[PDB]
Design a protein around this ligand. Sequence first.
Ligand SMILES: Cc1cc2c(cc1C)N(C[C@H](O)[C@H](O)[C@H](O)COP(=O)(O)OP(=O)(O)OC[C@H]1O[C@@H](n3cnc4c(N)ncnc43)[C@H](O)[C@@H]1O)c1[nH]c(=O)[nH]c(=O)c1N2
Ligand SMILES: Cc1cc2c(cc1C)N(C[C@H](O)[C@H](O)[C@H](O)COP(=O)(O)OP(=O)(O)OC[C@H]1O[C@@H](n3cnc4c(N)ncnc43)[C@H](O)[C@@H]1O)c1[nH]c(=O)[nH]c(=O)c1N2
Lengths: 364, 364, 386, 381
Amino acid sequence: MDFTTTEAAQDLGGLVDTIVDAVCTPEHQRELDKLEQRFDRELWRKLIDAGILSSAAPESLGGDGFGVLEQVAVLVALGHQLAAVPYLESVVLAAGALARFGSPELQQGWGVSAVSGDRILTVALDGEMGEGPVQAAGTGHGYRLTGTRTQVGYGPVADAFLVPAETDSGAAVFLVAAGDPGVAVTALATTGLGSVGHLELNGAKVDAARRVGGTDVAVWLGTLSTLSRTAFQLGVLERGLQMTAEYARTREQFDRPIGSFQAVGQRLADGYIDVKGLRLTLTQAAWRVAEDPADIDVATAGFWAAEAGHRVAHTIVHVHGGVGVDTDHPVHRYFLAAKQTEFALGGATGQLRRIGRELAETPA
Amino acid sequence: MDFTTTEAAQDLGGLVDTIVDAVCTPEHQRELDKLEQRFDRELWRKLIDAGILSSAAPESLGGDGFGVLEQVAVLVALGHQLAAVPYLESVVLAAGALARFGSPELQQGWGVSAVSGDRILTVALDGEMGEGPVQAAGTGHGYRLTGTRTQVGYGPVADAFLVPAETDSGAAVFLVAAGDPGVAVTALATTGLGSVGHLELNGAKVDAARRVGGTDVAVWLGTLSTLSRTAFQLGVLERGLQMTAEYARTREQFDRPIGSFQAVGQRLADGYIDVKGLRLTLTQAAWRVAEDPADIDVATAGFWAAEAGHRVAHTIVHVHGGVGVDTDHPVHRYFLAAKQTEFALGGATGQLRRIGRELAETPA
Amino acid sequence: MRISYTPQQEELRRELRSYFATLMTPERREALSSVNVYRETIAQMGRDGWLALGWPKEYGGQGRSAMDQLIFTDEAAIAGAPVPFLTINSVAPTIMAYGTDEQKRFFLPRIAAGDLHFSIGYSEPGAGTDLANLRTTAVRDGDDYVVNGQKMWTSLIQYADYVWLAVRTNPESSGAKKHRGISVLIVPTTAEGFSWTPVHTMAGPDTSATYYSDVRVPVANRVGEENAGWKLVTNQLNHERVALVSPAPIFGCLREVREWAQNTKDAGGTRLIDSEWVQLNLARVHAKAEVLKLINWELASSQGPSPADASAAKVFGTELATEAYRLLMEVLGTAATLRQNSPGALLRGRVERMHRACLILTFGGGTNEVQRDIIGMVALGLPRAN
Amino acid sequence: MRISYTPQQEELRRELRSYFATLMTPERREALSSGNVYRETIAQMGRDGWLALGWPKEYGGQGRSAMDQLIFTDEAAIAGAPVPFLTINSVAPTIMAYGTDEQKRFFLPRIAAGDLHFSIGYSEPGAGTDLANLRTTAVRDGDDYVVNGQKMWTSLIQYADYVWLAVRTNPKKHRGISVLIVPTTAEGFSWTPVHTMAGPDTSATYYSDVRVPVANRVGEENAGWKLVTNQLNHERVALVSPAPIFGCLREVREWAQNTKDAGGTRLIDSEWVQLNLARVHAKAEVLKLINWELASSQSGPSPADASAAKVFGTELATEAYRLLMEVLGTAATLRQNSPGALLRGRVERMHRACLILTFGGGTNEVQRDIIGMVALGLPRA
Ligand SMILES: Cc1cc2c(cc1C)N(C[C@H](O)[C@H](O)[C@H](O)COP(=O)(O)OP(=O)(O)OC[C@H]1O[C@@H](n3cnc4c(N)ncnc43)[C@H](O)[C@@H]1O)c1[nH]c(=O)[nH]c(=O)c1N2
Ligand SMILES: Cc1cc2c(cc1C)N(C[C@H](O)[C@H](O)[C@H](O)COP(=O)(O)OP(=O)(O)OC[C@H]1O[C@@H](n3cnc4c(N)ncnc43)[C@H](O)[C@@H]1O)c1[nH]c(=O)[nH]c(=O)c1N2
C-alpha cells in the first residue's frame, strides 16, 4: 500500500501549477469572460511550449509516453485555475483513443497533430434527451452519418470530433472533421460558460478509414471521460475550498473573523472531508485504470466528484456571501465550473446507478 | 386557513398528557422493560377509566363520535411518553375499520369491545420478505386462510386481527380470532422492544360473517396506518427534541452549557425544522383524511416521520452523549421508538416511492 | 381547522393568474431580463391597485389579509413579475407606522400608484450580516443632515427616485455599537453628492454600489426618531408582514419537469418518468416543497407568528431550493446545464436559471446560520453561542 | 504507487481470516453473545502472539507496521473478536514510553500473554468531552497516594485486574493530572454495572480512600495530561474499521440477490435497492481508503486526517445501516435473538452499536474544530 503518486506526476503537476498561476490571474479570467468562445489561447500556447501536451501522450503520436496518472495530475492542476483548454477532450480522450484503437493512418495525421497542439480534437459522447443515437449507413466508399450529439466540449473550436454511431455491424466510433459536408456545429450557452457545442450530422459522409474502431472505443472513452472530469473537479474544489478558508480567516463580521464562528468551521471541515473523499477515490480509480473491471472504482470517484461538487460549490458561495456571486471577484466561477462537471457526469445519481447495476449483476 | 386543531383535540391531548406524565415515570418505564410483552396495563386502565378510548370513536361502537383529528391528538400525546398501549392498533385502525366497513354484527361485538377496552384488536398489513399474500380459499360458506403476516403490533396480546388476503373475488379483509384453529402467534424481538408478533395462518377457518369488506378496507387501513404512526412519531420526536434541548441548556462542559456551542445549536435548530415539517405535513394529511387524493398527502407526512425520525433520533443521542445510551435514563427509548416507526413506515424511501408512482401515473 | 384555500382565495388566484399572464408576456419578460419597461410595468400594477392590496384602507389600500398577500407573492413568482416588494411591504408600512404626516401624504399615494420608486440602502462593504456595523454617517447642520459614506448591493438603483438609507447619527458621541443607534433617511437620487456604479452577479440580478459625498437632506426626511431606526429596518415590532420564501418556483419547476418526463422517451423507448430513480427525485422535491407551502400558509394565517417559525421557513426554504434544483437537473440529464436562450435549452432553461438565482437567498435576508441561532434561542431556549 | 495490499500484507490478512474463523467457533461466538470465555479468548490470542503484534521488539513485540495493525483490526472486526485494544494500544505503549523499569517488567509480558486486564478510568459524570475537568483526587501520604472520587463508563471492569486511572494531583485544570495503576483488589474500590441500549455493558467505579504506592504512578506527577491525550503520539492512530459496513453490505446484497419481490423478480433488481447499496459502497470506499492512507503514511499522519477519518466513518455508519435497513423491509428491526431475524440481526445490531462512536473518542464537533484549525488554518472559535 502506497499513496505517493509518481515522480513524473508530481513534476508535471508542479509545472502546470506554476504556469496557470502565472497566466490565470483574476484579471485574465475577466478577459476570458468577454470571449464568444472561452478558450484560453495564451495558456494553451504556454502549455504546448512547456511540453505539457506531449508529456503524457503515447510515443506513437510524438509524446513522451507517460500515462493516466500523469494525465490526472495535469487535470487536477488545470482545475485549480478553471483552465479553459481542451487537454481533456483533445489529448486525453481523442488522441488517446486514436493511439489505442485507430489505424496508423488516423494516428499519424490527426493523432500527432492533437498531441502537438496544432489541431483540437474532441469527443461527442452525449445525446439530446429523448433522441436516439447517430446512425451510420454503409455506402460504397464508407459511411453516411445522420444524427446529433450535444454538450460537446470545445465543439465550436474543434478541428474534428470522435462520434459514436450505430452501424449494421453494431456500434462504432467515427472521426468527423469540422469541414466535412453535412456537419454543423452550434455554440451552446451552459452553466459553466465554457466552449461547448451541439453537433448536427445530416448525411455526413465519411470514408471507411475514418472508422476508429468498434464498441470497445465508446466504452473506453466513457470510462476515461468520467475519470478525467473527476480529476479536473478535484482541482476546482480543492482550490475553491482553500480560497473560502482564506476568506473566512479574513472577512470580519461581529468584530471577528467569520471563520471563528463554529457553524462556519463545522461546514468547512465537512468540505475538507468531501474533497478528501474525492481525492482518495480519484487516486484509487486512476491506479485501477492504469492497471488496464475498473468501471466500479471509476464510478465511485465520479459519484464523489458530483457529490462533493454540489456540497462544496454551495459552501464556497454561502460562506463568501455577496462576494461569492459578484462577477468582479473570481469566486463565482468555481461554482459554475463545479456544477457544469457535476451534471456532465450524469450527477451523483447517474454514477450510483452504474455502481448499483454492477452490485446487482455480479454475485455477492 | 387555520392550522389550530379542534377544542376537543386540545382537551383530549391535554388529558392524555396529564395521564402519561403521572403513569409513565422513569421508574415505571424500567418496570415495563422487565415484561415479556411490553403492554402497559396500568396506563391502559387509566385511559379506559378517563374515557380516552371512547372519546374519538364512532357512536355506532359506543363512542362519543369525535374523529380523526381527535385520534391524532391522542396519538401525539401518547408518543410523548412512548406509550405501550394498542390505541392505534385496536381503536384507531381495527375498530375504525369495523365501524366504517363492517356489518352491524362485527360492530356490536368486536367493535364495541375494542372501544370499551375489554378486548384488544390489531391489524396485520405486513408480509414477510420473500413471501406472498395470505390466501383465502372459499369454503363455502366461509373461508380457509393460509399465509403469514409479520411485525403485527400487539400481536402476542391481541384477541383478534384484521388480516388482508387474496380471494377469487380479489382482495378482502377478514377478522381472525387468536383462538380460531389454524392461528398461531409468535413473539418478535424488535428494535423498539415493543409487543410485536408474527402471525401464522395454516388453513384458518373463518365464517363468511368475518369478512369485513373488500379491497377498499385494505386501502383505508394502509392509509390510516401511515397517518396514525406519523402522529405517534410526532409525539416521540417533539418530546425527544424538547428533552435534548433541556439537557443542552443545563449540561455543562468547558464551564458552559453544551447548548451554547454554535455547532450544537445549529443541529438542534435543524431538528426543530424537521419536527416542524412533520407537524405541518401531519396537519395537512389529517385534515384531508377527515375531509373524506388524501393518499399522496399522507405519504408526504409518512416520509417526514421517517426522515425526521432518522435525523432527530440521532441528534437526541449524540447531543446527550453517554446519557443517551444509558438504560438508567429515559432518553434511549426515544431512539428505539423512533427507529421502529421509521421502518414500520417502509422508510423514507417507501413513502417516496408511493408519491413518485402517483406523480408518474397522473398527468402533470 | 382548514388546510386549503377558501373559495374567495381561489378566485383571487384565478384572477391573478390571468392578470399576470396578460402582464408578463414574452415580450415584456425579454425586455426586463436584458441589459421604459420596468417603470411602465410597475405603474400598470399600481393603476390596477395591486401595489396597495395589503395596505390598510385608511392609507388607500384594499385592506386584504396576509393570506391574500401570500397568494399575490406566489402568483407574481409564477409569472416572473418584478413587484417591488421591499418598497410596498417594508418602506410603505414603515412610513405608515412611524412617519410624519407630510411623509404619509406625499409618499404613500405615489408608491401605491407605482410612480415613485425606492432602493434599499442598508448594507455596506463592512456591514453585511452584521448590519449594526454600518458606518455611513449623518451629521446635523441646521435643518439638514449631511450624509457621508457608501452602501453596497443597492438594488434597482437605476430606477430609484429615493434611497431608503440606514445611517449612523451622532457619530461624534461614539455610542456603543450594541445600542444600534441608527436612523432612517429618505434621500433623493437627484441629490448633489450622490452617485452609483453597477454590480453584476452570477446569480443573475444586477445591483449596485451607492456613494454619498456630503449629501444634504432635510431633517424632515428622517423617518422615525433620531437613533431609533433599528426597529424600523429590522421589523423588530412586527409593523410588517413576515417576508416569505415562495415555494411557487420549486413547484413550477417540478410540474414542468414532471410533464416533460411523462412525454419524453429514454433510449429503450420507455417514458423517462417510468424510471424509479426519476420518480424518487420528483417525489423528494414534492414532499419537501409541501413543507415550505404549509409553513408559509401557517405564517400568513397567523397574522404575531413566532420568530422561530419565520426563521425556520426561511432556512428550510432557501436550503430546499439548492437541493430541489439539483434533483430536477439530474432528471433533465444532458439538457440540465443549458441556459435560457441557449439553443437546446429545455423548459426555457428555467431550472438552470433558478439553481443560480436561489444562491442569493441563503445568505440574504439574514444568513441561515443566524436564522438557526434564532430558532435555537427562541424555540428551544438555548443560550447564546458567541 | 500501489492502492492495494503488498504480498506480505495480503498473507497477513489471509492468515488472520483463517485464524479468527478457527478461534471464533459457533460455541465460542454463542457464549460471547450472552474465567469464562472472554478471559480465555484473550489469553488464547495472547499465547498466539497477537496482542503484542504492534509493539517494539525491545518489549517482546513483533514490531509490525501500522498497516499490519489496520489489517488486524479489520479482521478482528470481521470475526467479532473481542480484542482489548485500549490495553494493548494505549496502556502498554504508555508504560513503554513513560513507565519505570519495574512497571515495564511486571506489566508488559503479562499484558502480551493476555493474562492481565485493564480498564480505562478516565471519564467522570462531570468530565466527558472536557476530561481536564476530572475531580477524582490523589493526595500524597508517605510512599502512597490516597485516592478519592469516582469514574463513569469504566468498561470491561468485571474482567479487570487494574484500572488505568486519571487523577488530580494538583488543585491550569489540565496541568494538575497524573496517571495511577490501581488494582481492582484494592480496599475502598467498588463498581456497579451500567447497561446501554447500544449493546455493550459498562460500569461506574468508586474509590473511597484507596491506597496505592507512588511506584504505581506512570510518568511524572501532574504531567499525566500528556499521557492520557497522546500529546506526543506515543500511540498509533485509532481507526474506525469499515469492515462491518462492507460485511453488512455484502450480506444484504447476497440476500437481495436470492430473495423474490412481489412478482418473482429479485429484490435486488429494483432500482431503489441498487441506489441504496451503491451509496453504501461508494461511501464505505472512502473510509477504507482514508484509513489505508493514515496507516501507510506511518511508515506522523496529519491530526486533520485522523480527525477527518473518525468523523467520516462514525457518521457514515449511522447512514449506511439506515440504507441497508430500508432494503431489509419488514425484517429490518428484528433483533439477533428473534424468530424471523435475517443475517442474524447483524444490521439491526450495528445500527445501535455504532451510536457510541460519534460522541466517543473525541466527539465529532470537536474533531471538526481540529480539521478547521489544522487543515484550513481557521481561528479558535
Ligand atoms: C444581488 C444582491 C442584492 C441585494 C443584496 C445582496 C446581493 C448579493 N443585499 C445584501 C444582502 O442581503 C447581503 O449580502 C446580506 O444581507 C449579507 O452580507 P455579506 O454579503 O457581506 O455576507 P457576510 O460577509 O456578512 O457573511 C458571509 C457568510 O459568513 C457567515 N456568517 C456571518 N455571520 C455569521 C454568524 N453570526 N454566525 C455564523 N456564520 C456567520 C455566513 O456563512 C455568511 O453567509 C442588499 N442589501 C441592501 O441593503 N439593499 C439591497 O437591495 C440588497 N439586495
Ligand atoms: C458504552 C460506553 C463505553 C465507554 C464510554 C462511554 C460509553 C457510553 N467512555 C466515555 C465516552 O467516550 C464519553 O461519553 C465521551 O468520551 C463523552 O462524554 P459525555 O458522555 O459526558 O458527553 P458530553 O456531555 O461531554 O458531550 C455531549 C455532547 O455535547 C456536545 N459537545 C460537548 N463538548 C462540545 C464542544 N466542545 N463543542 C461542540 N459540542 C460539544 C457534543 O454533541 C457531545 O456529544 C469511556 N470513558 C472511560 O474513561 N473509559 C471507558 O472505558 C469508556 N468506555
